[PDB]
């Protein structure tokens, strides 16, 4: 992530992530549909009885990206750390973690046709793919 890449993320998320917190259940669904594979196991959110958890969850994703994006300079391992938490403690496979980010970016492209620009998507995709561990 170059000094310029970081400036683009803040801009990108600034103008497009304001309502990201409202797209939990939808990004999850896009994943289940576009990527059926992730649907065979999924013992998360107790979907059988709800939408409350994936909904609340969708809020955490937005809040986390907001905090993570606001701190790309000082806390470069925010996403990395978050991803490890899921992979190692929450039983969430790094690919589902990566796919939900994709389906979240897709949702936003749906709900914001003139804000979600190609450059806005590349600037966010680059940040989201920076989930390795930085040093």
């Amino acid at each position: 992530l170059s000094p310029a890449d970081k400036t683009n993320v803040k801009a990108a998320w600034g103008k497009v992530g304001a309502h990201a917190g409202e797209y939990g259940a939808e990004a999850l669904e896009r994943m289940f549909l576009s990527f059926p594979t992730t649907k065979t196991y999924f013992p998360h959110f107790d979907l059988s009885h709800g939408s409350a958890q994936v909904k609340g969850h969708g809020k955490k994703v937005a809040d986390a990206l907001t905090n993570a994006v606001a701190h790309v300079d000082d806390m470069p391992n925010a996403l990395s750390a978050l991803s490890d938490l899921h992979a190692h403690k929450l039983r969430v496979d790094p690919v589902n973690f990566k796919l939900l980010s994709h389906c979240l970016l897709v949702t936003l492209a749906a709900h914001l046709p003139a804000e979600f620009t190609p450059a806005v998507h590349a600037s966010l995709d680059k940040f989201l793919a920076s989930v390795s561990t930085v040093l």
Partner: protein, 90 residues
């Protein structure tokens, strides 16, 4: 011969599409060939649905600009898919 406006528009999306494609770090995919296709097609659907509001002119030329774009987006995506395809065996 489609329009000096949409002519460049289509060129922009292909440049933007390349920086997107070119910044991809394969060691960080863990996605199957099958899903990588899905991802890329979503990225292309994305660009099309985007420039669908950017194309200018009359319906005839409208659908014409988009159709050329998608034709080109594929031309860039194909080498991408192939290289990534050759990331399995290796």
């Amino acid at each position: 011969a489609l329009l000096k406006a949409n002519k460049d528009l289509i060129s922009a999306g292909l440049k933007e599409f390349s920086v997107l494609l070119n910044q991809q770090v394969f060691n960080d995919a863990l996605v199957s060939e099958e899903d990588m296709v899905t991802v890329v097609e979503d990225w292309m659907n994305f660009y099309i649905n985007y420039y669908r509001q950017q194309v200018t002119g009359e319906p005839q030329e409208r659908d014409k600009a988009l159709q050329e774009l998608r034709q080109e987006l594929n031309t860039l995506a194909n080498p991408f898919l192939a290289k990534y395809r050759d990331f399995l065996k290796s």
